[PDB]
Amino acid sequence: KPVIGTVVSNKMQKSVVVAVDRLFHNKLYNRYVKRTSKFMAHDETNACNIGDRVKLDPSRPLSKHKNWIVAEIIKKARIYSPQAAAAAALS
């Protein structure tokens, strides 16, 4: 299918950690429980910040835990910079 997640960690070289979301159907009580799985992914150029929504593609094992390749960054996270904030404040 299509796996879309939010990046939660980018402090490795050529690697990101992406959190994916799913809904588990609790059959006895007939409600849906949100569950989370964290996935480690490959990103050669080191471009993903913390907070962006990326899409994952399956691949062969690249490390002990890295099994996914980042394919496209859907929505880019917003970053506040104080100096550029004051620069746009002056205008």
Binding site: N26, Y29, N30, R31, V33
Partner: protein, 124 residues
């Protein structure tokens, strides 16, 4: 509780203690009698009931009741012990089986005698 509460914490079961722990989930045990004595019941009933302190094969010290009329139990005597308490005597939780090991059957018993180990009398 709300359904969210039941999802986060489930439902437990009721607390109930085991009655016959010394049997250890077995129907009968084999024991050796340490003492054979009498005890008075709880009032208003007044009698002298025959009990025997039995050390079981798993090294447990229990009190057993002796059924029927008359007995021939001695000390260091091998008896078979089954579950089932006696209401008059507090702390006595077991019975001795008549008719096996050394505890003999009762001759002359005619009604309900297989509970006391008596053999079937000969029809003449």
């Amino acid at each position: 509780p709300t359904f969210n509460q039941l999802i986060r914490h489930g439902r437990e079961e009721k607390r109930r203690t085991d009655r016959t722990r010394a049997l250890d989930k077995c129907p009968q045990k084999t024991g050796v009698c340490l003492r054979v004595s009498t005890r008075t019941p709880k009032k208003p009933n007044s009698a002298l009931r025959k009990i025997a302190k039995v050390r079981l094969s798993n090294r447990h010290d229990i009190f057993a009741y002796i059924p029927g009329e008359g007995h021939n139990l001695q000390e260091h005597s091998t008896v078979l012990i089954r579950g089932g308490r006696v209401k008059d005597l507090p702390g006595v939780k077991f019975h001795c089986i008549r008719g096996v090991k050394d505890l003999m059957g009762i001759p002359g018993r005619r009604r309900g005698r297989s509970k006391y180990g008596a053999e079937k009398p000969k029809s003449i």
